[PDB]
Amino acid sequence: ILDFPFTWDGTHLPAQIGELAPVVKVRTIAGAEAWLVSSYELVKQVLEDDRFSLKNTSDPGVPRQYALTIPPEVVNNMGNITGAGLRKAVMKAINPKAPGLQEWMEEHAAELVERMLKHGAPVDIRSMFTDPFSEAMHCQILGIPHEAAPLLSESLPIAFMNSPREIPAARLNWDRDIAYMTARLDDTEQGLIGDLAKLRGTEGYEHVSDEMFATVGVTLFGAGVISTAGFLAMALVTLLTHPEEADHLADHPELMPQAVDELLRINLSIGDGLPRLAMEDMTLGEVEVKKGELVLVLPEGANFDPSVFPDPHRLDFTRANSSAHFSFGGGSHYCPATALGKKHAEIGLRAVLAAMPRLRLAVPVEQLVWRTGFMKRLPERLPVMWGSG
Ligand code: HEM
Ligand SMILES: O=C1N[C@@H](Cc2ccc(O)cc2)C(=O)N[C@H]1Cc1ccc(O)cc1
Ligand code: HPA
């Protein structure tokens, strides 16, 4: 019996990945059977076929990867936002081209980096950079006060838990976070919450409750902040384990857009599978998947498939097909925020590398503490030091 996940240690690809058949039976954190899918070919096939349903992964009594920390219907969040007529408002808010946002992200990154320079080495670049940068950007696009980020952010280490059991803290924090966004609809003039407040009580939006409106602010803050802060921390882990490549990118800032594609391809921040329930009997490679069975898509399996990414462990900023990675998923549930995610990372990484020469890990790499029982692989602290000039 093979247990999934394999390890919370994000310093390199788990040894198990190179040994997997493209489709393997595993036992999940919740005790269920699942088909783990790890070849580039079959990851593509699952993500691009809607008979492998994300929505149905929260149906009553279905095999689970781990306990829900949200209402079951919120697994279909993007579908619900569309059905409620709120897709236009959401796509506008997550567009990095929104007026002033690029200049705001550049000034905020510059400001956080200057605070790290005034503090001096060593610093925890997660709590002084990746977290505050990701949090404040999400307050900015939601339209809410930046001083709300600490309190909403406090929910995140529990909200994205991968637990064998129901987490009582998840419901307490959800209700608190929903109440907070509900209050913001009454006093917010700008960004997404401002937009939603203008739609509320107008023709065509009679079917949208206050709770449904609030659920858009809570879910986009949570999914955006955990994925952006999670990626940027683990992009810094990649660069800190390849300091010659990190030095090269600091001297060639014109590489940054290509660099972010290769950092996404090589990233180890995904600590679980992308879940899909088989809505009918289906052949997947050499495996017969029965209706009702859970399928776990492993993006790191596809992204380190040597038949698509030759020498997959090599960090090659100029890899021609970097952007063919599955770190934003694929098919119908493809991440709607790729433009923002890529731009946020480019600005954040440029600010760090321009100002912190010869950036290095300030502790032995095997002295990092890895978060366990969590959707993302993440070091609890990321202490860094840097040269002078
Ligand atoms: C580097 C940043 C990011 C990464 C690596 C990332 C990754 C992903 C992935 C892998 C999925 C697919 C889940 C699945 O197929 O089951 C996804 C979906 C999603 N992401 Fe992102 N994401 C990022 C940034 C963001 C941001 C900034 C937001 C929102 C502000 C966001 C909102 C969403 C939403 C709502 C979905 C669900 C889409 C659907 O069901 O159709 N993501 N993301
Ligand atoms: O299950 C969901 N839940 C929410 C995300 C979410 C999960 C928990 C939470 O407390 C807040 C948001 C969603 O938008 N769609 C789906 C899929 C998902 C999961 C994680 C993630 O980062 C992005 C998407
Ligand atoms: O890391 C992740 N795991 C599962 N689903 C996700 N949706 C966005 N990011 C993730």
From TrEMBL:
One of its GO terms (molecular function) is oxidoreductase activity, acting on paired donors, with incorporation or reduction of molecular oxygen. Heme b binds at residues 276, 333, 335. InterPro entries: Cyt_P450, Cyt_P450_B, Cyt_P450_CS, Cyt_P450_sf. The keyword Metal-binding applies. Keywords: Heme, Iron, Metal-binding, Monooxygenase, Oxidoreductase. Pfam families: p450 (PF00067). Hypoxanthine binds at residues 272, 376. Transmembrane segments: none annotated. Belongs to the cytochrome P450 family. This is Cytochrome P450. It comes from Streptomyces katrae.
